[PDB]
Design a protein around this ligand. Structure first.
Ligand SMILES: COC(=O)CNC(=O)c1cc(C)on1
Ligand SMILES: [Cl-]
Ligand SMILES: [Mg+2]
Ligand SMILES: [Mg+2]
Ligand SMILES: [Mg+2]
Ligand SMILES: [Mg+2]
Lengths: 194, 194
């Protein structure tokens, strides 16, 4: 039934743009929408990756590695899966492992890689692959792991037990002013619901 | 350490604006960020997303999802029922309202998240994730009556909670839909809890 008729640019920045989107609704009537898109997407299967990093060590409970950063759009600190945009020509797996190492210092091993999934499809066209990665915390490579943040990147690492993730998140939100990411919360919820 | 210095409007639509955010990086250097906000927020958050757990005796527990044409995505997406919280509406009540409009189901609140961010590197958009149980054996949920508001066109897809990630992958493989990130994160955690 439904499909895009036209996409009129409204305002283009260096990083983001706003479009008036015109589409066919499923009655046969023309309608419009305001859409956001990034300016950076090239041939990549998605804008970005987020990494679900399962830190595994012998005689430790598995931990989920998370990162805390200032997020200008939010006016505040956010707790999120390690994540970044996919470079031109880069595979999602490579981007995941690169971003993981840059933001946390850990070197991971790929476990699985999602199809491109939508970040906020009522608002934007942005997509990521969600890449599950196991981190062998017994390997010396991951012993005293040093984040190699990029220019103007400043990230703290927070590793939380998978078996208590949601309470550990609720506890952190109760103790400082910060926002947990919706994907992080959803994953912690399902850990509880299973 | 980091904080917002100022916000310059770049472009304001009916529904969404684009701002240039000037912020202080932790080294003492001033830096800029392109940020998207909705124009609709008062509110604890912009919206709600409902995790609807359909419980029928002698049946697998299902998670109820909606498929909708998403203009920014230029395609159909599979998502948790969701909408914006009406000014003067609680997140809980928004959840039940939305769940009923989108799916026809009448649920009960199990729990409700703090405001969580949707894509904090791009937008300030936030939601409450609201876990609802649906008594599928109740007479009110026998033939669930979905109420599409103006310009909403919503298919309901219920999937077994214990195979959710495999079932979502099937739909993407077979049907060229995009799965929402929050839905995929929850589906992953269901598999990862084992
Ligand atoms: C040299 O300038 C920068 O790298 C600042 N980055 C952004 O403004 C930005 C906005 C969005 C979306 O993603 N990155
Ligand atoms: Cl439940
Ligand atoms: Mg990042
Ligand atoms: Mg990075
Ligand atoms: Mg909706
Ligand atoms: Mg609705």
């Amino acid at each position: 039934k439904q499909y895009i008729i036209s996409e009129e640019l409204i305002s283009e920045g260096k990083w983001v743009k706003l479009e008036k989107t015109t589409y066919m609704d499923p009655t046969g009537k023309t309608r419009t929408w305001e859409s956001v898109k990034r300016t950076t997407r090239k041939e990549q299967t998605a804008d970005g990756v987020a990494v679900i990093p399962v830190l595994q060590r012998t005689l430790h409970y598995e931990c989920i590695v998370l990162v805390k950063q200032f997020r200008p759009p939010m006016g505040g600190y956010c707790i999120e899966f390690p994540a970044g945009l996919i470079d031109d020509g880069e595979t999602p797996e490579a981007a995941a492992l690169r971003e993981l190492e840059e933001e946390t210092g850990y070197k991971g091993d790929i476990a699985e890689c999602s199809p491109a999934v939508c970040m906020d499809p009522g608002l934007s066209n942005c997509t990521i692959h969600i890449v599950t990665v196991t981190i062998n915390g017994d390997d010396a490579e991951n012993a005293r792991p040093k984040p190699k943040p990029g220019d103007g990147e400043f990230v703290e690492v927070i590793s939380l037990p998978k078996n208590d993730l949601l309470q550990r998140l609720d506890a952190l939100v109760a103790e400082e002013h910060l926002t947990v990411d919706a994907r992080v919360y959803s994953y912690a919820l399902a850990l509880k619901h299973a």
